[PDB]
Amino acid sequence: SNMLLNYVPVYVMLPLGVVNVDNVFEDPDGLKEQLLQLRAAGVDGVMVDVWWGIIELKGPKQYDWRAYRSLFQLVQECGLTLQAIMSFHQCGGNVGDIVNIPIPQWVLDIGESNHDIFYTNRSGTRNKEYLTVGVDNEPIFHGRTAIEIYSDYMKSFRENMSDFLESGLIIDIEVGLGPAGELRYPSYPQSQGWEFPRIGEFQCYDKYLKADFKAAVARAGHPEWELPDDAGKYNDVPESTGFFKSNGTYVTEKGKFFLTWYSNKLLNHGDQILDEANKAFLGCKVKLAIKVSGIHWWYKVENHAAELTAGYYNLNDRDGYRPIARMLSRHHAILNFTCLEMRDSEQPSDAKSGPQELVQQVLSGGWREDIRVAGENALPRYDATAYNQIILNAKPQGVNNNGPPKLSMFGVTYLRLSDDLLQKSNFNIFKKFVLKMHADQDYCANPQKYNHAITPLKPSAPKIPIEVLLEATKPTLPFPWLPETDMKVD
Numbered sequence: 001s002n003m004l005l006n007y008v009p010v011y012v013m014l015p016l017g018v019v020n021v022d023n024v025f026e027d028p029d030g031l032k033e034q035l036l037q038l039r040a041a042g043v044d045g046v047m048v049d050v051w052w053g054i055i056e057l058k059g060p061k062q063y064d065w066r067a068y069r070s071l072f073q074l075v076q077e078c079g080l081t082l083q084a085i086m087s088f089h090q091c092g093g094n095v096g097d098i099v100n101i102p103i104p105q106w107v108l109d110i111g112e113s114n115h116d117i118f119y120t121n122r123s124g125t126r127n128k129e130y131l132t133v134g135v136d137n138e139p140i141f142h143g144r145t146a147i148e149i150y151s152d153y154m155k156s157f158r159e160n161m162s163d164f165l166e167s168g169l170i171i172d173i174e175v176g177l178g179p180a181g182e183l184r185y186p187s188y189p190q191s192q193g194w195e196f197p198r199i200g201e202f203q204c205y206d207k208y209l210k211a212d213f214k215a216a217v218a219r220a221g222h223p224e225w226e227l228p229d230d231a232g233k234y235n236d237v238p239e240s241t242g243f244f245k246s247n248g249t250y251v252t253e254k255g256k257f258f259l260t261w262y263s264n265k266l267l268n269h270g271d272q273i274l275d276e277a278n279k280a281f282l283g284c285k286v287k288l289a290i291k292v293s294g295i296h297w298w299y300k301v302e303n304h305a306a307e308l309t310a311g312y313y314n315l316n317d318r319d320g321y322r323p324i325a326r327m328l329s330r331h332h333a334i335l336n337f338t339c340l341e342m343r344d345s346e347q348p349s350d351a352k353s354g355p356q357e358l359v360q361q362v363l364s365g366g367w368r369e370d371i372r373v374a375g376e377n378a379l380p381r382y383d384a385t386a387y388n389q390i391i392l393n394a395k396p397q398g399v400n401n402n403g404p405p406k407l408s409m410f411g412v413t414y415l416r417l418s419d420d421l422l423q424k425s426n427f428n429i430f431k432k433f434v435l436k437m438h439a440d441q442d443y444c445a446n447p448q449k450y451n452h453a454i455t456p457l458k459p460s461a462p463k464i465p466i467e468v469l470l471e472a473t474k475p476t477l478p479f480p481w482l483p484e485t486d487m488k489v490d
């Protein structure tokens with residue numbers, strides 16, 4: 001078989017705020033010239049947030065899709081495909097967020113009187129950037145549940161963009177499932193102080209989650225069990241907490257129970273919303289996708305504190321990602337792992353970071369469950385080092401010059417399309433990165449040639465019981481990686 005079979009597509013995220021808070025597509029002209037540069041560089045497509053907070057601003061079911069329709073049109077004119085994010089979260093308190101885009105005011109208004117719709121930490125601070133999983137099924141939003149809101153939104157998107165969908169412009173739908181659109185709790189909120197090097201805090205203190213937990217422990221036979229009170233604060237180090245130190249809580253009957261409860265809430269959150277998405281896009285030629293954050297800090301200590309915390313119950317003897325991947329399999333969905341570029345050697349030593357190991361674990365898990373795996377770089381990078389790292393992860397075993405590679409990622413979405421990217425020296429480098437992703441082939445407009453034809457979305461396969469999902473916690477050995485890519489940028 002042909003080299004083309006080694007091609008991994010490359011997408012570029014558009015600027016945050018290309019459609020502003022007023023639901024105005026600001027500067028089509030400017031964007032156009034940028035897109036035109038990407039098309040000439042060989043870029044396959046672009047990625048864009050479809051802000052819930054801009055679209056359904058006015059009131060329940062009051063959608064205005066017009067500015068996004070103009071944007072999609074322009075993208076289509078430029079010869080690019082598109083990955084659309086159903087962004088149900090706020091833009092603003094996370095790294096890189098240069099524009100503030102909140103969730104719908106009308107939802108914020110309800111929150112003014114029911115503060116428990118937001119993720120809450122132990123001190124009672126409410127995070128407004130995303131609705132707590134606790135209200136997924138509470139019919140408190142003018143008669144609707146949170147899940148119904150998301151569902152109606154994606155139905156409306158489908159119907160109103162049907163022309164673009166049927167013309168094959170949209171290739172994937174990324175379903176926003178938490179802060180930054182990631183399936184995770186907001187355990188590391190910059191808006192609350194949290195400084196990169198730190199463990200984060202558990203976010204299950206709203207009343208709904210707290211009631212759920214209390215009932216569950218009672219059913220387990222331990223009504224007296226409480227939510228964690230010895231876990232420390234955002235910038236703690238594990239050893240300094242009662243929860244995470246060795247022989248700490250987190251290895252106690254109660255701790256295991258809580259951790260399982262806390263991580264399973266995400267699993268179920270993701271599973272139910274994907275169900276709604278699968279129904280909304282049923283029959284369309286798109287793939288569904290979710291985003292999983294890459295929390296590499298503390299990975300190298302037994303407690304994996306930052307990962308627990310974020311809701312990923314991942315230890316050295318309990319695979320907390322594979323279950324996600326298994327969950328995604330019934331929906332035929334892609335696991336978009338949002339950190340690909342980092343090297344262990346670039347992290348401060350005291351962070352106990354294992355970015356490369358984390359990556360091998362998460363991808364392998366996906367490949368092992370037989371789902372498609374994609375990813376993004378986490379921070380803005382313009383150097384060959386970064387690029388070669390992404391290329392290695394894209395094809396961990398190198399290129400197969402006589403067939404499809406044994407392992408390959410389904411796609412990579414580079415982090416943001418800025419002036420910087422476009423500067424002469426930086427752009428020259430990017431161009432090579434694109435070439436190497438493409439396995440030295442020219443841009444290939446018809447993805448069928450490289451075994452990426454998109455078929456009409458099928459209905460999800462039947463529910464997998466939590467017990468079965470939880471079987472995927474069994475640790476496995478990762479697939480083997482080359483030390484270096486066989487296709488470098490230099």
Ligand SMILES: OC[C@H]1O[C@H](O[C@H]2[C@H](O)[C@@H](O)[C@@H](O[C@H]3[C@H](O)[C@@H](O)[C@@H](O[C@H]4[C@H](O)[C@@H](O)[C@H](O)O[C@@H]4CO)O[C@@H]3CO)O[C@@H]2CO)[C@H](O)[C@@H](O)[C@@H]1O
Pocket residue numbers: 013016048049085087090091092094095096097179180181182196291292293294295296337338339376377378379
């Ligand atoms: O336009 C699309 C979305 O873009 C923005 O969200 C993206 C993040 O900016 C990008 O990093 C990533 O998410 C998480 C990373 O996987 C995770 O590593 C971590 O990043 C750490 C980093 O590793 C550490 O070295 C650094 O110094 O601290 C960082 C944490 O602040 O957290 C990232 C965020 O959870 O992908 C995201 C989604 O595409 C916008 O914020 C989002 O609103 C847009 O929807």
